[PDB]
């Protein structure tokens, strides 16, 4: 599935994600667009061959399995394909954990060059939530 932007922000809401660990809203719209396009199929392999899986990239060297990164972790105790689908629960609890973990959302690193510092809040301008 590729959400529309206030799609995403409103599923984002319900699922408890403002302010969570103080990032607002917007935060997470951000980092959802420029990591996966707001496509909850979105996958890319790393250089250190992990994969980055779903709407937030959420990573497999730590948090999810994918039978594939040898010597790596399941931190969100789920397989990554889980957080490939329409529905956004499984990365939208992976990234609570993910956030939780010390560096907030330095973890993704689109959100650091490309969200952070910015008027996040430009990215639900305009919904309805
Ligand atoms: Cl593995
Ligand atoms: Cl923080
Ligand atoms: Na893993
Ligand atoms: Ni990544």
Same mark, same amino acid.
């Given at each position: 599935?590729?959400?529309?932007?206030?799609?995403? !922000? %409103?599923?984002?809401? +319900?699922?408890?994600?403002?302010?969570?660990?103080?990032?607002? =809203?917007?935060?997470?719209?951000? %980092?959802?667009?420029?990591?996966?396009?707001?496509?909850?199929? !979105?996958?890319?392999?790393?250089?250190?061959? @992990?994969?980055?899986?779903?709407?937030?990239?959420?990573? @497999?060297?730590?948090?999810?399995?994918?039978?594939?990164?040898?010597?790596?972790?399941? /931190?969100?105790?789920?397989?990554?394909?889980?957080? =490939? @689908?329409?529905?956004?629960?499984?990365?939208?609890?992976?990234?609570?954990?993910?956030? @939780?973990?010390? $560096?907030?959302? $330095? %973890?993704?690193?689109?959100? +650091? $060059?490309?969200?952070?510092?910015?008027?996040?809040?430009?990215?639900?301008?305009?919904?309805? /939530?």
């Amino acid at each position: 599935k590729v959400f529309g932007r206030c799609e995403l !922000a %409103a599923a984002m809401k +319900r699922h408890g994600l403002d302010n969570y660990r103080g990032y607002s =809203l917007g935060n997470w719209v951000c %980092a959802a667009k420029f990591e996966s396009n707001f496509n909850t199929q !979105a996958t890319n392999r790393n250089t250190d061959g @992990s994969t980055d899986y779903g709407i937030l990239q959420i990573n @497999s060297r730590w948090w999810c399995n994918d039978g594939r990164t040898p010597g790596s972790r399941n /931190l969100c105790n789920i397989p990554c394909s889980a957080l =490939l @689908s329409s529905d956004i629960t499984a990365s939208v609890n992976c990234a609570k954990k993910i956030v @939780s973990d010390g $560096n907030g959302m $330095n %973890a993704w690193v689109a959100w +650091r $060059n490309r969200c952070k510092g910015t008027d996040v809040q430009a990215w639900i301008r305009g919904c309805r /939530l």
